[PDB]
Amino acid sequence: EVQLVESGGGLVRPGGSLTLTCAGSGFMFRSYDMHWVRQAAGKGLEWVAGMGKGGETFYAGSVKGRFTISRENARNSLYLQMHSLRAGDTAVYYCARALTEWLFQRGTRNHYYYGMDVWGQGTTITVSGASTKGPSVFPLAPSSKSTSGGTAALGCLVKDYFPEPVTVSWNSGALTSGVHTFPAVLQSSGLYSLSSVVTVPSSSLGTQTYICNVNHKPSNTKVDKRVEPK
Amino acid sequence: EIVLTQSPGTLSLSPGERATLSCRASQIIDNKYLAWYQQKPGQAPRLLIYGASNRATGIPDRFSGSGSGTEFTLIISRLEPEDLAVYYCQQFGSSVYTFGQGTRLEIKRTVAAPSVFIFPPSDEQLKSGTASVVCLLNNFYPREAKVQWKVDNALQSGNSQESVTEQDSKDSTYSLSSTLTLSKADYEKHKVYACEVTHQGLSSPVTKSFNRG
Amino acid sequence: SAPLHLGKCNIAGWILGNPECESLSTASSWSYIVETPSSDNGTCYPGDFIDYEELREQLSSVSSFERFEIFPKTSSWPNHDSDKGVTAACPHAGAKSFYKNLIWLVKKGNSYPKLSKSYINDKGKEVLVLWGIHHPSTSADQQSLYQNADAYVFVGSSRYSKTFKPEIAIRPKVRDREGRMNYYWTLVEPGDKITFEATGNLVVPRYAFAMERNAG
Ligand SMILES: *[C@@H]1O[C@H](CO[C@@H]2O[C@@H](C)[C@@H](O)[C@@H](O)[C@@H]2O)[C@@H](O[C@@H]2O[C@H](CO)[C@@H](O[C@@H]3O[C@H](CO)[C@@H](O)[C@H](O)[C@@H]3O)[C@H](O)[C@H]2NC(C)=O)[C@H](O[C@@H]2O[C@@H](C)[C@@H](O)[C@@H](O)[C@@H]2O)[C@H]1NC(C)=O
Hints:
The complex is a heterotrimer of chains A (230), B (213) and C (216).
Chain A: E1 3-7, E2 11-12, E3 18-25, E4 33-39, E5 45-51, E6 57-59, E7 67-72, E8 77-82, E9 91-105, E10 108-119, E11 123-127, E12 136-140, E13 151-161, E14 167-170, E15 179-181, E16 185-187, E17 191-201, E18 211-216, E19 221-226
Parallel strand pairs in A: 2-11
Antiparallel strand pairs in A: 1-3, 3-8, 4-5, 4-9, 5-6, 7-8, 9-10, 9-11, 12-13, 13-17, 14-18, 15-17, 16-17, 18-19
Chain B: E1 4-7, E2 10-13, E3 19-25, E4 34-39, E5 46-50, E6 54-55, E7 63-68, E8 71-76, E9 85-93, E10 96-99, E11 103-107, E12 115-119, H1 123-126, E13 130-140, E14 146-151, E15 154-155, E16 160-164, E17 174-183, H2 184-189, E18 192-198, E19 206-211
Parallel strand pairs in B: 2-11
Antiparallel strand pairs in B: 1-3, 3-8, 4-5, 4-9, 5-6, 7-8, 9-10, 9-11, 12-13, 13-17, 14-15, 14-18, 16-17, 18-19
Chain C: E1 4-5, H1 11-16, E2 33-34, H2 52-58, E3 62-68, E4 87-92, E5 95-97, E6 102-104, E7 115-120, E8 126-135, H3 139-146, E9 153-156, E10 161-164, E11 180-188, E12 193-198, E13 202-205, E14 208-213
Parallel strand pairs in C: 1-2
Antiparallel strand pairs in C: 3-14, 4-5, 6-13, 7-12, 8-11, 8-13, 8-14, 9-10, 9-12
A molecule of 5 linked components (NAG-NAG-BMA-FUC-FUC) binds at residues 8, 18-20, 36, 38-41, 44, 89-91, 175-176 of chain C.
Subunit structure (chain C): Homotrimer of disulfide-linked HA1-HA2. Interacts with human CACNA1C.
Subcellular location (chain C): Host apical cell membrane; Virion membrane
Family (chain C): Belongs to the influenza viruses hemagglutinin family.
């Protein structure tokens, strides 16, 4: 399978350093240009750095002098070393591969670019002086009342956590229909909080078991919480 | 030094209609260096068009790129709810890559009322000194929705936050969660807790409520 | 010292031996080259032609010019198949074909042993040598053509030293091909040895050119 996986993201002090790694598989690494593209929450895509097959490097004006891109085709690995990090560097950073090419045609050498082709899942970088701490997970237990329409809602409140993100699943991924995990909000304490919810037929409340699974990588936290009717 | 200005900023259209997206270059750009991308909610971008007019492999016939000079257009002939995403144009110039600011493609739908739910604080949170009261609004359209917190029939403000999901690629709805944070003392000092919801699909405001604490 | 008229072809088509192009093999000098620069009969199998503009200036005016068979087709390659290297990308006379002055070697049976071939310049003149490097589209074709998955090519002389690795990747179709072939040229000085090593992917010279140049 053609694939790209980013790793190395996390929390770093302003003015500090961090090195990202992109591992590829299913494809010949040396055949492709490699790129990093960052996206801040709710904002557009920003190209930051790129590299040719033969190792020449390219950089966006906003990162020249602070980021260094390198690749080791023997390890199928792209690297992005970062220093002098600023707050405005916080984003999810993507890895992407692309084909460029010179074709001899009509008597001249013609250059082509065929687009950024395979993208990674993204790894998140947060630049602040604040500290990491894992979330607390509280049940959002369905209503004992009502159930006449047959639809009940239940969920989990993932509260007081830094930094972003957490992931939430339900019943270890066996429950996906009707699941909504909301975008986190930054509350005045400097900590984020979100809730995941799912709506089920209210007759399921008496026969099904519901568990939310909460991942908070930056604090290495795995919390499974059962949501029972009150 | 190349800027791509992309318009319209947001595009609301119904399934089956044709979507025309524009990408304008601050300067003439060679066709072979313009690309288009799709970023569905929660996902990585997907390449759609390369060299202004050639489809990437695995991209259906209804996606078509065209244009020249400084004006470039992406076109989606027969919209589907799955086409919900943000669309970015890209260009190569001066050994640098730049994107456009993106175009929200929003899927128009029939009006759908939200089903409202309210959850009192958990006993686990209360012993830590804080109360959270959550009001869920589920699967509604259009997106504009108002949530009003009432603590013993007293309108609240400045103590509640909310966030909205992006539009569901299947039923084209939104969902909304609003949380009311209160100290344990303030929570146990009052009784009736309710959230008031007004929506286009609602003739009258809908109130859900509990009482304890 | 009449002009060298290439007809509908350009220098790349002539010098590589594109089957659409006349060899002009008896032309032993010329004042200048009459060319169709925009011809499609330069390179028929798609790829880059490294330093093409330099080669045009090298060949612009010659006072002596001799094509010779540097690596004779029927005998230079006893451990490799030199009789299958034709392609639909290079059609001629209704059949699959290839360049006149290059041989696209593939494996003999199911083994591509280590190729190593040398030419020592005894012509007393700068010798023009062209070769190609082939880049399959898939790992399947790499083994069908060359057996060895981690093939390499090495070309070395007094002025040139480079190892090539095959860049396997599916590329947009040019002349209905998803792989590529890159074309390279170099001059071998009087007395110097040029060595070709390869465990795959090498498009070997058949013909080379001994040249002296017209300058004043
Ligand atoms: C030799 O050159 C031919 C054309 O060169 C032209 O003729 C000579 C006389 C001279 O005037 C030159 O100045 C001219 O440019 C090649 O035929 C042409 O090949 C191109 C490349 O594919 C083709 O363009 C494409 O056409 C397809 C549709 O068929 C289209 O999808 C592409 O986008 C692109 O437009 C031309 O149509 C074609 N012209 C003619 C008249 O046939 C020839 O190429 C060989 O033959 C063609 C038909 C293809 O099979 C090629 O793959 C193949 O290599 C050249 N032959 C060699 C061996 O180099």
